Amino acid sequence: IQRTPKIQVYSRHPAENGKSNFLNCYVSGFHPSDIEVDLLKNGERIEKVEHSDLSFSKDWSFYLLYYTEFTPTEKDEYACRVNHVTLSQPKIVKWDRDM
Amino acid sequence: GSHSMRYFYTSVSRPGRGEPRFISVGYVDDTQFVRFDSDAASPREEPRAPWIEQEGPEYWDRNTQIYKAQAQTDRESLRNLRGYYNQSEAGSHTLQSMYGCDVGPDGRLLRGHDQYAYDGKDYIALNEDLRSWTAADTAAQITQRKWEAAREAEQRRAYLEGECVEWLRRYLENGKDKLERADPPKTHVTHHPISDHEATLRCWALGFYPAEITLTWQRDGEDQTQDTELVETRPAGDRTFQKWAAVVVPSGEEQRYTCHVQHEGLPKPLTLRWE
Amino acid sequence: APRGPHGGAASGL
């Protein structure tokens, strides 16, 4: 029995165009633990993205935080792209600073 | 108030790609403070919180030995579990371990935990009495009989009531500026037009620690559990957490909706409205 | 600190 990841894409602080910040992709609720996560800037993969140490919740499902420093603008689109055994194709979630 | 220490072990087999990987992380409450990874270049317990860095070389050495030994033990366990479920050697499997202690304000043991899951499902757990086990299935009953024969629960209990509590007390003392500090949520309500006759009200909670929070919408003082969209509490990356809750409201009816925030950093629960 | 294997051939599953 496997569990598909929940995905949230969001900033560390309320986004302000021109101000430095951190872009997060939080993946959680998944099993097994192998998972691939990309952060995308205008569709392309951001390099040297760091992540938290693998850990898990009380229901044994895993969670990871992927993060990178970003300076948001009104132009630039950001997203998180997630692959997992439970997914037939990569799942992309767009960054919406209202969410 | 209450505090917890928890270790989280994950062992994952990967036939054809080496021996199983063992990774451990340690937490006090919602604060990770150590890690160990058998896939590291030079596997060693490493500090992940400022207040643990003061521990001497003896600490890191001892704990590192414990993790390496545990990785080996887990590899044997994974072999056995394979057998217990009549599984081949070809598949990948996961063994997770979660244990630790909860203490109150006076530092006395409130509760101990020591449990296990195999391939994501509960396998065996030490009962609250710290003297007996609950097995989830006939495979775990084999583990249970083995541990009863070995009086294993007594060792687990000895750790939980002894070293676990004392180390937690020590960590709470050394990291008190963070571990004993609740950061209240910063809160606001946003308004997002959906259509001519409908809009979203979203109640935000930002920058709070620990993660436990209650965030609800009411319409005319009545809870809107079914009509509220509530995201999972998420880490900001600066130790703090975030959460929001949203409701769809008919145009003009916005002032009938209130957002309610409970958090331990809040002396009294907040009530917010749009603007 | 993690629980040490003082037992110690029986702590496995």
Side-chain angles (χ1 to χ4, degrees):
Chain A
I1 296 309
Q2 306 171 316
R3 284 179 273 184
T4 209
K6 301 171 295 198
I7 310 162
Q8 292 193 66
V9 195
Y10 57 97
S11 53
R12 177 179 298 179
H13 304 105
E16 176 192 4
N17 290 335
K19 193 187 194 339
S20 191
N21 201 332
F22 276 87
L23 177 70
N24 297 323
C25 183
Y26 181 61
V27 288
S28 61
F30 58 97
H31 218 285
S33 55
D34 279 346
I35 194 168
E36 300 304 329
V37 175
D38 300 310
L39 291 174
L40 304 178
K41 176 180 181 179
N42 295 317
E44 301 300 321
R45 175 174 200 235
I46 299 175
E47 298 193 358
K48 300 178 179 181
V49 170
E50 297 171 77
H51 61 81
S52 60
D53 303 322
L54 183 64
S55 188
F56 53 86
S57 304
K58 278 198 249 169
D59 65 7
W60 304 105
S61 65
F62 294 99
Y63 63 86
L64 290 170
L65 181 64
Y66 282 74
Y67 56 99
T68 189
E69 171 186 312
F70 75 124
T71 293
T73 73
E74 196 167 82
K75 214 80 167 180
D76 295 324
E77 245 298 331
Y78 289 92
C80 182
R81 179 174 64 203
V82 180
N83 285 283
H84 190 253
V85 62
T86 63
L87 298 172
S88 58
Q89 237 206 315
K91 184 173 298 186
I92 295 106
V93 178
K94 291 176 164 53
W95 178 54
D96 180 345
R97 25 180 175 256
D98 293 330
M99 294 178 57
Chain B
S2 178
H3 297 281
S4 58
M5 183 169 71
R6 292 283 190 284
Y7 286 90
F8 301 83
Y9 300 169
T10 306
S11 290
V12 181
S13 64
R14 42 184 175 190
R17 299 191 294 110
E19 290 304 312
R21 180 185 183 235
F22 177 88
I23 180 182
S24 174
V25 292
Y27 279 79
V28 173
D29 303 323
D30 287 317
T31 297
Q32 187 197 346
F33 72 103
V34 287
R35 73 176 177 192
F36 174 94
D37 188 351
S38 70
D39 275 353
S42 179
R44 183 171 172 78
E45 191 187 51
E46 297 180 339
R48 300 287 282 161
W51 45 265
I52 199 64
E53 298 190 315
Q54 58 188 299
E55 299 295 345
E58 295 84 358
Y59 176 90
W60 306 111
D61 295 337
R62 194 187 64 252
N63 295 346
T64 294
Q65 292 184 42
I66 287 166
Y67 293 129
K68 291 173 73 69
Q70 186 67 67
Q72 296 307 315
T73 299
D74 271 21
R75 286 167 186 188
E76 185 65 15
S77 293
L78 282 165
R79 290 191 279 276
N80 287 351
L81 289 155
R82 259 195 303 225
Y84 299 161
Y85 289 103
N86 309 304
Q87 295 166 332
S88 80
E89 297 150 73
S92 59
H93 300 278
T94 306
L95 173 62
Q96 293 164 270
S97 309
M98 182 171 58
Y99 68 89
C101 47
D102 309 336
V103 304
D106 62 346
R108 295 189 176 273
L109 177 70
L110 294 177
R111 169 80 191 251
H113 307 266
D114 196 340
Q115 60 187 312
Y116 300 83
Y118 183 61
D119 286 338
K121 311 198 287 78
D122 285 276
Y123 181 78
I124 196 174
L126 186 67
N127 295 338
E128 190 170 5
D129 59 19
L130 310 186
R131 296 176 77 179
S132 59
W133 309 90
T134 298
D137 55 35
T138 56
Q141 292 174 14
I142 302 310
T143 298
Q144 175 175 2
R145 297 163 191 176
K146 281 176 186 174
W147 278 350
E148 286 166 347
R151 292 187 170 274
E152 183 66 21
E154 286 163 50
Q155 302 275 35
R156 308 312 182 90
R157 175 185 175 181
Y159 171 80
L160 293 167
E161 297 195 298
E163 290 88 350
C164 187
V165 170
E166 295 311 298
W167 282 112
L168 179 50
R169 301 270 281 286
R170 173 172 173 82
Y171 301 155
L172 286 169
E173 178 60 45
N174 289 345
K176 54 181 171 188
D177 297 355
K178 288 214 202 296
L179 297 176
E180 300 268 359
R181 188 185 85 237
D183 298 322
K186 310 165 194 174
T187 58
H188 71 281
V189 176
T190 59
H191 183 277
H192 316 267
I194 297 166
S195 68
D196 274 10
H197 66 276
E198 271 190 340
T200 304
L201 289 186
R202 181 168 290 105
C203 189
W204 289 84
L206 298 165
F208 56 92
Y209 178 97
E212 168 65 39
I213 197 171
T214 298
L215 194 60
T216 57
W217 277 103
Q218 288 179 16
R219 173 190 166 94
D220 298 340
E222 223 50 62
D223 294 347
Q224 303 289 293
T225 304
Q226 313 302 335
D227 302 285
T228 301
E229 175 183 28
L230 184 69
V231 296
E232 182 182 24
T233 303
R234 67 202 190 187
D238 54 8
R239 135 188 166 103
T240 71
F241 297 86
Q242 312 179 348
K243 199 188 193 62
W244 57 254
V247 284
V248 176
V249 310
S251 298
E253 299 191 5
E254 283 85 356
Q255 291 314 305
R256 297 170 66 182
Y257 289 82
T258 51
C259 176
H260 302 263
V261 188
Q262 305 195 339
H263 186 269
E264 81 157 274
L266 296 174
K268 62 165 117 161
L270 288 176
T271 294
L272 302 85
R273 277 158 284 253
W274 178 36
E275 63 229 329
Chain C
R3 182 183 65 87
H6 329 130
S11 308
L13 283 68

